[PDB]
């Protein structure tokens with residue numbers, strides 16, 4: 642059947658770790674005082690959670706309270722373990738407390754408050770320099786979680802909280818994050834549709850950290866070309882077609898052939914034949930100031946069908962696109 646695959650970096654981080662690290666089900670969670678937090682306003686409701694702005698009435702600080710839904714309640718030990726494992730890491734959201742909501746009767750995660758700007762409004766204003774700056778900041782967080790044996794699996798603009806006034810960024814929502822174990826087959830029903838990697842779209846389960854790099858490339862393409870989202874699929878099948886109309890069908894077929902993947906036959910009447918498009922097609926007078934040869938070289942090194950061929954987060958940080966960024 643499918644040819645197996647392994648990450649080319651941090652392959653055996655979890656195979657050496659004591660069971661207690663990646664064995665999240667064993668992990669015992671100590672509940673704090675739900676009463677220490679006063680809910681202020683509902684910020685939004687997701688498929689798996691409800692997010693509230695709240696005040697920690699003991700220190701008067703603003704915090705974010707995420708109340709998990711019944712379906713996401715079952716996978717609380719995994720998210721809590723990952724959050725505790727990455728706490729203090731570069732640009733990782735800090736878990737301040739874990740309390741039992743008295744109404745839902747499900748777990749509520751308390752997080753540090755970030756003065757974010759709506760990504761829809763903020764991507765319309767970023768300069769070339771800020772795009773490079775914030776991308777480098779996101780890479781710090783990805784190399785950190787990947788170095789700790791963790792795949793985020795939901796990298797997208799909504800999960801990157803940016804305080805544009807203090808030039809600070811946090812990678813949030815570790816609800817879909819998972820421990821990387823070499824040879825493990827994972828669920829492909831992860832990430833948001835526009836940021837799903839080709840491995841998920843073609844149902845290749847033996848994926849790794851490189852999935853986050855594809856998601857990151859999708860975000861980069863959206864920022865430099867001022868098209869959000871860059872790959873606008875109508876559904877998960879159309880999503881692959883949108884990608885193929887840009888990257889071409891020959892390289893997609895080469896990728897499926899390399900891993901001996903059987904494409905869903907539904908793709909036969911919708912995929913067609915498409916040559917790879919040169920990036921100049923996406924360049925117009927309104928976005929040319931965000932596009933450079935370094936930006937395109939970097940984007941071409943993230944947006945590859947072959948997950949094994951994508952830059953790793955650490956290699957990405959070495960790219961010339963970041964030479965202008967003050968380090």
Ligand SMILES: O=C(O)c1ccc(Nc2nc(-c3ccc4ccccc4c3)cs2)cc1O
Nearest residue numbers: 684685686687692705707734752813814815
């Ligand atoms: O999961 C996490 O670690 C996590 C950490 C911090 C955090 N902060 C914040 N969230 C929001 C927010 C705004 C609009 C929304 C619309 C639909 C659904 C949700 C929404 C959440 C604003 S500031 C949120 C998180 O979910």
